[PDB]
Amino acid sequence: STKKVTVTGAAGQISYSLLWRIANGEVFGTDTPVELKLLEIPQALGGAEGVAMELLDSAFPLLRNITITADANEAFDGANAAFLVGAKPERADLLANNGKIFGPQGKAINDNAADDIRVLVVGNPANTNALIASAAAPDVPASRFNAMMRLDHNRAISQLATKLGRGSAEFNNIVVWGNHSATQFPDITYATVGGEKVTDLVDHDWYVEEFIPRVANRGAEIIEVRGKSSAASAASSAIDHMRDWVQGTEAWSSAAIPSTGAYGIPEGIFVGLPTVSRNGEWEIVEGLEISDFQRARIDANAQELQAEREAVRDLLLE
Amino acid sequence: STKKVTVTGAAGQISYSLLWRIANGEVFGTDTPVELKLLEIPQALGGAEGVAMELLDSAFPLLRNITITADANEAFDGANAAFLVGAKPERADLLANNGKIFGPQGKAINDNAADDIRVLVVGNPANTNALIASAAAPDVPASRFNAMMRLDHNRAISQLATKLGRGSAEFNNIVVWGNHSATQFPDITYATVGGEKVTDLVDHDWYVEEFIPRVANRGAEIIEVRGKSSAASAASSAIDHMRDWVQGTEAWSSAAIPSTGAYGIPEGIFVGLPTVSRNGEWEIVEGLEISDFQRARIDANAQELQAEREAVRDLLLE
Ligand SMILES: NC(=O)c1ccc[n+]([C@@H]2O[C@H](COP(=O)([O-])OP(=O)(O)OC[C@H]3O[C@@H](n4cnc5c(N)ncnc54)[C@H](O)[C@@H]3O)[C@@H](O)[C@H]2O)c1
Ligand SMILES: NC(=O)c1ccc[n+]([C@@H]2O[C@H](COP(=O)([O-])OP(=O)(O)OC[C@H]3O[C@@H](n4cnc5c(N)ncnc54)[C@H](O)[C@@H]3O)[C@@H](O)[C@H]2O)c1
């Protein structure tokens, strides 16, 4: 019952934190054996050999095989899950410079991966990289591509937990709507902490003017204090996302999934939405009411995502 | 029922891989809340503040609090478990330079930790650093201090797995006797795989002349292929040791524990031994027969540990 798991950018900072928490059985379960398929660029293939050697040396009982390649067809062959972490850390330059990676990777997924493939895009810009990847994969349902907004979601929960002196575990119904950028909307409209509305426990003006920018700009705060961008927390958030996708969760998880036209967000973009996992599928929470406050922030994110889609329109292979 | 866990060298490479696999419940169990107590030297507090920020951002349900300090009394206050990773990179000079750290840290554990304290010493030279820390803790049983030989043990099982095309988990009764150095003795005398003796499956001369130095010099091999000593695999092995210590194992684990005089090893050193974990204690496997082959290699390790102990004799506080 071996799960084949591809990780791109395997010689990078995020992957170094990621791979030990796939191998330990955290994602697919402690009784599910795994094989790690590492993809890098030719220049970083030596880096990737060193990490395969450290993985072997860890003697993970569930880790049955480790393959290292610069060939996307080899890396995605039989893949049941993929973490597309590989990318290089002006905005138009980044959309196109990383955009051109995800078309070929989406094609390689399309042509080589198992029927049950699930793909999480971590590489920035995440939501538009998932669009490009999905558009090169006409034989794979769009819903098998997600972009990661779980770091934003985890940072929102963590800031709420420090503000109220409560446990992170105690919060329910956090949504981070939209794009993985400074436009993101960490939304506490439905949030509860032990029977009580969170909106009852925090000053609305503090939430709008302090909490939203603190979460939305947290990555810059990490670079300031650390000297380089987050890695362990980004990997942690990717492990949470794939674990919830695969095992299921009734906790709202802020999966960035293909827009269906729900909540007046147009089709053709990948968006943070209020999302639960059942039978290996994300489901949009239906029947929520949208305030004018909410509407302005959700439409700001939808609009930004359509801007990004038009910037990379010629990188859409199909 | 919150476990307080101290990690020293918290701004370093190993701790960066270690802390996410404590916070996730892997060590004490998925129902046991944890508090992380990070200790660093003054010049690295900024770094450890970075790490505490990413830990918070991960929104671990079991992580109830994170403390950062340069004061060893604060770091060890009520500690239930400790990972002593903090250390600096000629042997006589390394023994003294890192030796002078572990005396004070043992005193700090003695004066401040909970009754149930368990201490794993990772910082090199590991076996002698455990001796020094234990000598500075007269009110703590010496058996609450261990040195990490689990990476050596994990490497031995992984090279056996490669050589025989078997899963790492299929191996039983592996022991790495002695010191965490190039003198270590990965011993297959008792080891089994698929109901056969490992010694019936490998050439004795390859084992002695290829396998032993490959395991014993693997560190140098990692520094070679990566340009950076192992971190992720060192952390993974530290997780394995503490998990096994706390949760129990029927598998021999190679804990470096205080010599009782078993197998003709003199008392007063910390030495890798054939060891299983029951009810929170390492138990030496008794009644094994020792061949002349084994005796030479066990005695060479015992004698090296007596050399090291004599080199640091004036650093023993009590
Ligand atoms: N929440 C999120 O979505 C989130 C969080 C943090 C970081 N990120 C992003 O994750 C990505 C990786 O971050 P990092 O710190 O690991 O970067 P890194 O520089 O440490 O690692 C990236 C690795 O990807 C490799 N790579 C480049 N092109 C590749 C290709 N075509 N195929 C495979 N690998 C390729 C590089 O060789 C490098 O080893 C960046 O885009 C970063 O901005 C996203
Ligand atoms: N199997 C093993 O036992 C094993 C395996 C690998 C490495 N190691 C050892 O583990 C240690 C850590 O390796 P690393 O890669 O994390 O090193 P690193 O240099 O990346 O990190 C070491 C950290 O310890 C800190 N430190 C120094 N003196 C300290 C003190 N007195 N109190 C608290 N913190 C202090 C430093 O500031 C630094 O942040 C080294 O001694 C290394 O040789 C042992």
XYZ file of C-alpha atoms and ligand atoms in Angstrom:
724
model
C 0.000 0.000 0.000
C 3.086 2.285 -0.598
C 2.419 6.026 -1.238
C 4.767 7.606 -3.802
C 5.440 11.216 -2.747
C 7.299 13.727 -4.981
C 8.997 16.763 -3.419
C 10.478 19.396 -5.819
C 13.108 21.889 -4.684
C 14.452 18.922 -2.572
C 17.869 20.619 -1.812
C 16.183 23.806 -0.385
C 15.365 25.108 3.146
C 11.618 24.164 3.185
C 12.223 20.602 1.859
C 14.977 20.048 4.510
C 12.220 20.626 7.190
C 9.474 18.904 5.095
C 10.952 15.461 4.198
C 11.518 14.147 7.817
C 7.790 14.853 8.616
C 6.564 12.904 5.547
C 8.955 9.966 6.322
C 7.791 9.728 10.005
C 4.179 8.853 8.829
C 2.649 12.279 9.866
C 0.957 12.825 6.393
C -0.431 9.407 5.270
C -0.445 7.629 8.708
C 1.939 5.617 10.946
C 0.959 2.285 9.195
C 1.398 3.647 5.579
C 4.833 3.090 3.941
C 6.185 5.826 1.644
C 8.734 6.374 -1.148
C 10.292 9.864 -1.552
C 10.953 11.043 -5.127
C 13.179 14.146 -4.972
C 13.275 16.517 -7.981
C 15.928 19.225 -8.387
C 17.634 21.218 -11.155
C 20.916 19.695 -12.427
C 23.096 22.270 -10.512
C 21.516 21.253 -7.102
C 21.479 17.436 -7.664
C 24.549 17.018 -5.335
C 22.626 18.863 -2.581
C 19.745 16.414 -3.121
C 22.155 13.381 -2.883
C 23.293 14.603 0.592
C 19.644 14.884 1.814
C 18.837 11.339 0.442
C 21.895 10.092 2.462
C 20.652 11.860 5.679
C 17.111 10.349 5.076
C 18.587 6.818 4.732
C 20.695 7.351 7.916
C 17.445 8.209 9.880
C 16.259 4.551 9.452
C 12.550 5.527 9.086
C 10.602 2.229 9.233
C 7.965 3.601 6.749
C 10.551 4.935 4.194
C 10.851 2.033 1.667
C 12.745 3.869 -1.152
C 14.404 7.266 -2.032
C 14.968 8.436 -5.705
C 16.826 11.686 -6.756
C 16.424 13.112 -10.301
C 16.490 16.245 -12.521
C 13.912 14.495 -14.850
C 10.309 15.592 -14.051
C 8.913 12.419 -15.769
C 11.052 10.193 -13.463
C 10.220 12.341 -10.334
C 6.377 12.241 -10.938
C 6.241 8.564 -12.123
C 3.391 6.825 -10.171
C 3.231 9.835 -7.722
C 0.194 9.726 -5.295
C 1.131 13.158 -3.758
C 3.411 16.068 -4.808
C 4.780 19.045 -2.820
C 5.830 21.589 -5.530
C 8.327 23.515 -3.377
C 10.903 24.233 -6.113
C 10.968 27.896 -7.235
C 13.283 30.960 -6.791
C 12.382 33.088 -3.658
C 9.235 43.267 -9.252
C 6.089 41.002 -8.958
C 5.525 40.605 -12.810
C 9.149 39.255 -12.983
C 8.324 36.652 -10.239
C 4.965 35.601 -11.841
C 6.775 34.807 -15.165
C 10.184 33.707 -13.736
C 8.490 30.981 -11.550
C 5.429 30.621 -13.814
C 7.535 28.981 -16.552
C 8.531 26.115 -14.049
C 4.925 25.086 -13.236
C 3.665 24.530 -16.810
C 6.193 21.737 -17.542
C 5.698 20.321 -13.960
C 1.915 20.232 -14.521
C 2.466 18.439 -17.894
C 4.837 15.906 -16.175
C 2.145 15.310 -13.450
C -0.500 14.910 -16.193
C 1.599 12.416 -18.203
C 3.169 10.339 -15.329
C 1.344 10.601 -11.912
C -1.169 8.000 -10.504
C -4.979 8.466 -10.935
C -5.279 9.527 -7.235
C -2.599 12.352 -7.407
C -2.956 15.321 -5.012
C -0.659 18.370 -5.626
C 0.166 21.127 -3.078
C 1.951 24.206 -4.555
C 4.183 25.954 -1.977
C 6.465 27.768 -4.510
C 5.542 31.500 -4.923
C 3.393 32.975 -6.241
C 1.489 29.899 -4.920
C -2.135 30.517 -6.119
C -1.063 31.467 -9.695
C 1.588 28.654 -9.855
C -1.266 26.175 -9.043
C -3.352 27.739 -11.905
C -0.458 27.327 -14.430
C 0.233 23.734 -13.205
C -3.462 22.725 -13.425
C -3.831 24.320 -16.961
C -0.961 22.068 -18.272
C -2.815 18.964 -16.862
C -6.034 18.560 -18.902
C -6.447 14.846 -17.826
C -6.179 15.666 -14.026
C -9.207 17.313 -12.306
C -8.374 20.967 -11.351
C -9.458 20.061 -7.733
C -6.314 17.872 -7.415
C -4.275 21.158 -7.386
C -4.226 23.345 -4.203
C -2.006 26.332 -3.276
C -0.833 26.610 0.350
C -2.518 29.274 2.518
C -2.164 27.122 5.700
C 0.859 29.184 6.818
C -1.363 32.350 6.726
C -4.150 30.368 8.491
C -1.746 28.961 11.166
C -0.308 32.520 11.730
C -3.900 33.912 12.185
C -4.761 31.162 14.803
C -1.389 31.754 16.573
C -1.899 35.611 16.760
C -5.509 35.088 18.044
C -4.117 32.625 20.683
C -1.460 35.109 21.987
C -3.960 38.081 22.020
C -6.662 36.224 24.102
C -4.188 34.080 26.192
C -5.983 30.906 24.878
C -4.667 27.635 23.344
C -4.415 27.543 19.487
C -6.396 24.205 19.727
C -9.400 26.098 21.231
C -10.249 28.143 18.020
C -12.800 27.005 15.332
C -13.942 28.504 11.944
C -10.886 30.617 10.881
C -10.950 31.507 7.122
C -8.067 33.215 5.244
C -9.810 34.202 1.952
C -8.029 34.982 -1.310
C -4.380 35.151 -2.458
C -1.113 34.244 -0.631
C 0.043 37.962 -0.639
C -0.329 41.145 1.581
C -3.929 41.389 0.120
C -4.944 38.165 2.041
C -8.031 38.433 4.360
C -7.736 36.593 7.738
C -11.468 36.631 8.633
C -12.763 36.135 12.227
C -16.489 36.711 11.272
C -17.431 33.041 12.218
C -14.512 32.313 14.565
C -15.298 30.832 18.018
C -13.101 30.030 21.059
C -15.018 27.684 23.452
C -18.696 28.631 22.786
C -17.924 32.404 22.487
C -17.699 34.511 19.274
C -14.095 35.770 18.842
C -15.625 39.070 17.500
C -17.127 39.538 21.034
C -13.590 39.199 22.606
C -11.519 41.559 20.347
C -11.759 45.254 19.440
C -12.945 45.334 15.762
C -10.558 48.324 15.043
C -7.489 46.515 16.541
C -8.436 43.411 14.415
C -8.770 45.442 11.159
C -5.763 47.797 11.709
C -3.276 45.646 13.766
C -4.123 41.884 13.452
C -4.818 41.785 9.635
C -1.512 43.527 8.634
C 0.501 41.560 11.310
C -0.663 38.221 9.748
C -0.528 39.551 6.137
C 3.074 40.876 6.606
C 4.377 38.116 8.964
C 6.813 36.758 6.343
C 8.622 40.165 6.201
C 8.693 40.127 10.072
C 10.320 36.643 9.958
C 13.009 37.838 7.388
C 13.703 40.896 9.672
C 14.267 38.842 12.909
C 15.724 35.642 11.239
C 17.826 37.114 8.324
C 16.177 34.700 5.793
C 12.543 33.649 5.070
C 10.511 31.098 7.094
C 11.279 27.377 6.437
C 10.287 25.097 9.371
C 6.897 26.896 9.827
C 6.224 26.761 6.015
C 7.058 23.015 5.983
C 4.874 22.500 9.173
C 1.917 24.221 7.390
C 2.432 22.090 4.230
C 2.429 18.897 6.454
C -0.860 20.094 8.098
C -2.450 20.856 4.674
C -1.639 17.454 3.044
C -2.464 15.484 6.299
C -5.942 17.182 6.488
C -6.548 16.762 2.727
C -5.701 12.997 2.916
C -7.024 12.018 6.413
C -9.975 14.506 6.661
C -10.808 17.359 9.082
C -13.951 19.118 10.347
C -11.671 22.114 11.282
C -11.895 24.942 8.672
C -8.438 24.717 7.011
C -8.174 27.613 4.400
C -7.267 25.325 1.424
C -6.650 27.458 -1.748
C -8.785 25.424 -4.256
C -10.257 26.138 -7.737
C -13.039 28.766 -7.507
C -16.521 27.296 -8.318
C -18.307 30.732 -8.373
C -19.206 30.294 -4.645
C -19.362 33.547 -2.552
C -19.409 35.626 -5.800
C -15.749 34.767 -6.638
C -15.321 34.169 -10.406
C -14.163 30.845 -11.956
C -10.587 30.399 -13.233
C -8.521 31.221 -10.060
C -7.163 29.289 -7.024
C -8.471 30.946 -3.790
C -8.363 30.577 -0.017
C -11.923 29.521 1.003
C -13.663 28.177 4.158
C -12.887 24.472 3.577
C -13.264 21.069 5.305
C -11.928 17.636 4.139
C -14.247 14.598 3.755
C -13.424 11.394 1.773
C -10.102 12.932 0.537
C -11.885 16.003 -1.015
C -11.994 19.679 0.118
C -15.640 20.897 0.478
C -16.536 24.631 0.572
C -18.572 25.507 3.733
C -21.921 26.726 2.217
C -24.641 29.096 3.595
C -22.333 31.674 5.303
C -23.549 35.331 5.198
C -21.106 37.937 3.709
C -21.005 41.462 5.266
C -20.083 44.538 3.126
C -16.791 44.523 5.206
C -16.054 40.883 4.093
C -17.200 41.554 0.469
C -14.657 44.440 -0.078
C -11.709 42.211 1.122
C -12.836 39.028 -0.779
C -13.355 41.059 -4.012
C -9.875 42.740 -3.500
C -8.348 39.183 -3.479
C -10.481 37.881 -6.456
C -9.447 40.992 -8.471
C -5.716 40.547 -7.580
C -5.934 36.829 -8.651
C -7.543 37.797 -12.034
C -4.693 40.398 -12.483
C -2.135 37.608 -11.867
C -3.942 35.201 -14.231
C -3.837 37.841 -17.028
C -0.099 38.449 -16.360
C 0.686 34.666 -16.920
C -2.037 33.993 -19.551
C 0.541 32.911 -22.229
C 2.114 30.380 -19.733
C -1.190 28.458 -19.663
C -0.153 25.456 -21.892
C -3.752 24.304 -22.590
C -0.332 17.107 32.461
C 2.112 19.479 30.543
C 5.728 18.233 29.980
C 8.404 20.979 30.191
C 11.187 20.243 27.656
C 14.487 22.236 27.607
C 16.480 22.491 24.347
C 20.002 24.089 24.505
C 21.753 25.403 21.352
C 18.192 26.383 20.198
C 19.436 28.817 17.412
C 21.516 25.968 15.834
C 21.092 23.530 12.887
C 20.114 20.379 14.910
C 17.547 22.276 17.128
C 15.962 23.801 13.949
C 15.112 20.161 12.820
C 14.457 18.935 16.436
C 11.873 21.438 17.859
C 9.030 20.738 15.286
C 9.186 16.966 16.111
C 8.825 17.642 19.881
C 5.939 20.137 19.366
C 4.061 17.671 17.060
C 3.655 15.081 19.893
C 6.234 12.574 18.463
C 8.273 12.381 21.755
C 5.729 12.291 24.673
C 2.579 11.240 22.691
C -0.215 13.002 20.721
C -2.245 13.683 24.005
C 0.662 15.256 25.998
C 0.960 19.057 25.955
C 4.499 20.464 25.897
C 6.269 23.695 26.932
C 9.543 24.447 25.083
C 12.358 26.114 27.080
C 15.043 27.375 24.657
C 18.555 28.095 26.053
C 21.196 30.008 24.011
C 24.313 32.146 24.696
C 23.662 35.931 24.725
C 24.926 36.482 21.128
C 22.333 33.941 19.722
C 19.175 35.108 21.667
C 18.009 37.013 18.509
C 18.237 33.714 16.545
C 16.282 31.761 19.245
C 13.602 34.559 19.208
C 13.299 33.897 15.419
C 12.783 30.119 16.136
C 10.153 30.794 18.878
C 8.285 33.059 16.355
C 8.155 30.263 13.662
C 7.137 27.672 16.362
C 4.214 29.971 17.387
C 3.272 30.495 13.674
C 2.950 26.636 13.305
C -0.069 26.648 15.694
C 0.779 23.213 17.191
C -2.220 22.113 19.316
C 0.138 20.540 21.999
C 2.560 23.560 22.290
C 1.181 25.547 25.302
C 4.199 27.873 25.895
C 7.697 28.833 24.536
C 10.406 30.498 26.739
C 13.763 31.863 25.426
C 16.643 32.656 27.855
C 20.436 32.877 28.236
C 20.011 31.945 31.983
C 20.439 28.164 32.516
C 18.440 28.260 35.852
C 15.383 29.723 33.968
C 15.874 27.237 31.033
C 15.868 24.115 33.334
C 13.189 25.358 35.863
C 10.737 22.410 36.378
C 12.193 20.698 33.240
C 10.847 17.099 32.765
C 13.184 16.398 29.764
C 16.278 18.105 28.268
C 18.147 17.882 24.905
C 21.683 19.333 25.463
C 22.507 20.301 21.842
C 24.504 23.496 22.652
C 28.282 23.025 22.058
C 31.208 24.542 20.004
C 32.762 22.869 16.860
C 42.651 18.813 18.471
C 40.615 16.370 20.706
C 42.180 17.451 24.121
C 41.090 21.065 23.211
C 37.535 19.985 22.137
C 37.063 17.938 25.389
C 37.999 20.994 27.567
C 36.342 23.692 25.383
C 32.899 21.904 25.442
C 33.595 20.247 28.862
C 33.412 23.631 30.717
C 29.785 24.193 29.348
C 28.313 20.859 30.636
C 29.499 21.217 34.281
C 27.425 24.378 34.834
C 24.488 22.892 32.823
C 24.482 19.724 35.037
C 24.463 21.996 38.177
C 21.577 24.058 36.636
C 19.628 20.747 36.038
C 20.480 19.615 39.594
C 19.264 22.904 41.163
C 16.103 23.619 39.061
C 14.717 20.569 37.055
C 11.743 18.364 38.143
C 12.288 15.057 40.048
C 11.507 13.018 36.848
C 14.159 14.826 34.645
C 15.604 12.797 31.677
C 18.622 14.393 29.908
C 19.934 13.439 26.433
C 23.396 14.877 25.608
C 23.895 15.462 21.857
C 26.708 18.102 21.932
C 30.165 16.512 21.280
C 32.137 14.893 22.697
C 28.749 13.327 23.726
C 29.833 10.472 26.112
C 32.258 12.662 28.132
C 29.819 15.667 28.149
C 27.203 13.334 29.783
C 29.870 12.263 32.371
C 30.649 15.968 33.160
C 26.932 16.987 33.392
C 26.160 13.949 35.617
C 29.138 14.709 38.002
C 27.712 18.311 38.525
C 24.276 16.807 39.521
C 24.819 14.884 42.829
C 21.018 14.912 43.641
C 20.045 13.419 40.168
C 20.655 9.675 39.509
C 23.447 9.292 36.842
C 20.955 7.065 34.831
C 18.830 10.220 34.117
C 21.790 11.315 31.848
C 22.402 9.595 28.435
C 24.700 10.417 25.481
C 23.292 9.993 21.951
C 24.632 7.030 19.995
C 21.265 6.585 18.136
C 22.595 8.255 14.908
C 25.465 5.680 14.825
C 22.826 2.948 15.460
C 20.456 4.325 12.790
C 23.419 4.493 10.297
C 24.383 0.851 11.043
C 20.783 -0.371 10.375
C 20.496 1.775 7.186
C 23.816 0.362 5.702
C 22.655 -3.209 6.624
C 19.287 -2.445 4.868
C 21.069 -1.193 1.662
C 23.553 -4.173 1.653
C 20.828 -6.889 1.996
C 17.954 -5.063 0.140
C 15.797 -5.251 3.336
C 13.601 -2.680 5.208
C 15.420 -0.950 8.140
C 12.493 -2.109 10.420
C 13.228 -5.864 9.665
C 16.515 -5.760 11.766
C 16.547 -6.906 15.431
C 19.302 -6.881 18.148
C 21.695 -4.205 16.717
C 24.111 -2.626 19.232
C 26.773 0.096 18.714
C 29.083 -0.368 21.770
C 31.334 2.308 23.182
C 32.140 5.930 22.403
C 30.498 8.303 19.855
C 33.784 8.423 17.757
C 35.636 6.522 14.974
C 36.408 3.835 17.709
C 32.671 2.824 17.904
C 31.793 -0.860 17.393
C 28.582 -1.491 15.390
C 28.128 -5.168 16.370
C 26.046 -7.675 14.307
C 26.891 -10.706 16.560
C 23.226 -11.042 17.768
C 21.403 -9.246 14.867
C 18.622 -10.993 12.863
C 16.593 -10.184 9.687
C 13.791 -12.426 8.293
C 14.505 -15.092 10.965
C 18.190 -15.504 9.944
C 21.428 -14.268 11.593
C 22.904 -11.211 9.831
C 26.383 -12.896 10.249
C 25.151 -15.843 8.020
C 24.133 -13.233 5.309
C 27.252 -10.950 5.026
C 30.956 -11.687 4.463
C 32.811 -11.286 7.826
C 35.792 -9.435 6.159
C 33.478 -6.941 4.306
C 31.638 -6.307 7.643
C 34.938 -5.717 9.549
C 36.832 -3.837 6.756
C 34.013 -2.027 4.829
C 30.847 -1.766 7.026
C 32.485 -0.766 10.384
C 34.569 2.191 9.042
C 31.674 3.303 6.714
C 29.316 3.597 9.743
C 32.109 4.951 12.013
C 33.242 7.612 9.420
C 29.738 8.484 8.075
C 29.889 11.972 9.648
C 32.984 12.824 7.554
C 31.058 11.342 4.508
C 28.118 13.727 5.175
C 30.457 16.797 5.667
C 31.965 15.720 2.236
C 28.750 15.374 0.091
C 26.885 18.344 1.776
C 29.650 20.757 3.029
C 27.689 20.925 6.372
C 27.703 18.270 9.204
C 24.383 16.330 9.555
C 21.475 18.189 11.234
C 18.106 16.624 10.195
C 19.338 12.998 10.766
C 21.012 13.981 14.121
C 17.671 15.574 15.268
C 15.652 12.513 13.957
C 17.966 10.148 16.021
C 17.543 12.431 19.114
C 13.708 12.201 18.641
C 14.097 8.357 18.353
C 16.181 8.106 21.601
C 13.877 10.311 23.804
C 10.636 8.751 22.324
C 12.018 5.225 23.007
C 13.249 6.274 26.510
C 9.734 7.671 27.452
C 7.351 5.311 25.512
C 9.337 2.006 25.757
C 10.772 -0.322 23.097
C 11.377 -4.090 22.739
C 14.093 -3.253 20.088
C 17.751 -2.837 21.163
C 18.360 0.949 20.845
C 22.081 1.630 21.716
C 21.514 4.154 24.584
C 24.909 5.470 25.887
C 24.180 4.990 29.672
C 26.283 4.967 32.893
C 28.510 1.847 32.992
C 27.377 -0.517 35.789
C 30.559 -2.684 35.251
C 28.503 -4.971 32.893
C 30.436 -6.846 30.131
C 33.748 -5.949 31.911
C 33.391 -2.204 31.171
C 34.746 -0.144 34.112
C 32.318 2.085 36.116
C 32.537 5.902 35.777
C 31.923 6.256 31.971
C 28.875 6.683 29.638
C 28.975 3.907 27.040
C 26.726 2.520 24.246
C 25.271 -0.860 25.386
C 22.594 -3.362 24.262
C 19.591 -1.592 25.831
C 15.779 -1.679 25.765
C 13.346 0.737 27.461
C 10.657 -0.367 29.983
C 8.661 1.962 32.272
C 10.843 5.039 31.549
C 14.228 3.267 32.176
C 16.943 1.829 29.894
C 17.601 -1.834 30.784
C 20.938 -3.482 29.815
C 20.414 -6.815 27.962
C 22.091 -9.333 30.353
C 23.781 -12.717 29.764
C 25.170 -12.111 26.244
C 28.342 -14.154 25.308
C 31.336 -11.948 24.249
C 33.728 -13.364 21.574
C 37.473 -12.416 21.550
C 36.558 -10.364 18.358
C 33.916 -8.343 20.356
C 36.151 -8.011 23.488
C 39.055 -6.259 21.609
C 36.597 -3.630 20.142
C 34.577 -3.173 23.413
C 37.863 -2.831 25.396
C 39.233 -0.273 22.843
C 36.084 1.913 23.408
C 36.176 1.511 27.279
C 39.901 2.539 27.208
C 39.200 5.605 24.982
C 36.382 6.695 27.387
C 38.833 6.329 30.375
C 41.368 8.471 28.392
C 38.681 11.208 27.805
C 37.502 11.080 31.470
C 41.143 11.587 32.663
C 41.513 14.539 30.203
C 38.451 16.305 31.824
C 38.982 15.078 35.431
C 39.334 18.685 36.816
C 35.980 19.655 35.097
C 34.095 17.147 37.294
C 32.437 19.626 39.796
C 31.791 17.067 42.568
N 3.131 29.766 2.487
C 3.732 29.602 1.326
O 3.136 29.384 0.262
C 5.216 29.777 1.356
C 5.895 29.969 2.566
C 7.260 30.251 2.553
C 7.959 30.130 1.371
N 7.304 29.862 0.195
C 8.029 29.639 -1.087
O 8.580 28.335 -1.137
C 9.583 28.331 -2.182
C 10.812 27.611 -1.693
O 11.357 28.313 -0.546
P 12.770 27.855 0.045
O 13.104 28.673 1.219
O 12.794 26.368 0.191
O 13.765 28.221 -1.146
P 15.250 27.658 -1.415
O 16.034 28.617 -2.253
O 15.929 27.305 -0.127
O 14.901 26.312 -2.165
C 14.301 26.253 -3.472
C 14.905 25.082 -4.189
O 14.125 24.841 -5.383
C 15.011 24.505 -6.409
N 14.408 24.737 -7.718
C 14.497 25.827 -8.562
N 13.916 25.622 -9.716
C 13.461 24.305 -9.656
C 12.798 23.473 -10.577
N 12.499 23.839 -11.824
N 12.528 22.193 -10.190
C 12.877 21.810 -8.954
N 13.499 22.502 -7.998
C 13.767 23.748 -8.426
C 16.300 25.276 -6.160
O 17.337 24.558 -6.799
C 16.374 25.252 -4.630
O 17.160 24.157 -4.176
C 9.793 29.807 -2.574
O 9.037 30.124 -3.737
C 9.241 30.537 -1.344
O 8.847 31.871 -1.607
C 5.924 29.790 0.178
N 25.193 11.812 17.211
C 25.573 12.862 17.918
O 25.806 12.831 19.132
C 25.758 14.140 17.147
C 25.397 14.220 15.811
C 25.687 15.385 15.100
C 26.295 16.455 15.739
N 26.494 16.434 17.086
C 26.892 17.654 17.840
O 25.746 18.435 18.163
C 26.218 19.774 18.453
C 25.319 20.782 17.775
O 25.476 20.688 16.348
P 24.785 21.818 15.425
O 24.954 21.458 14.001
O 23.399 22.064 15.876
O 25.678 23.099 15.758
P 25.383 24.642 15.459
O 26.651 25.414 15.549
O 24.507 24.727 14.253
O 24.498 24.972 16.724
C 25.106 25.000 18.050
C 24.394 26.045 18.871
O 24.762 25.891 20.269
C 24.888 27.175 20.808
N 25.690 27.120 22.016
C 27.053 27.245 22.147
N 27.444 27.215 23.396
C 26.271 27.113 24.136
C 26.023 27.089 25.520
N 26.981 27.165 26.441
N 24.730 27.026 25.921
C 23.771 26.965 24.983
N 23.879 26.982 23.656
C 25.176 27.064 23.296
C 25.476 28.046 19.700
O 25.209 29.411 19.958
C 24.708 27.505 18.489
O 23.523 28.266 18.305
C 27.696 19.817 18.027
O 28.522 19.583 19.157
C 27.805 18.628 17.077
O 29.133 18.136 16.969
C 26.363 15.243 17.760
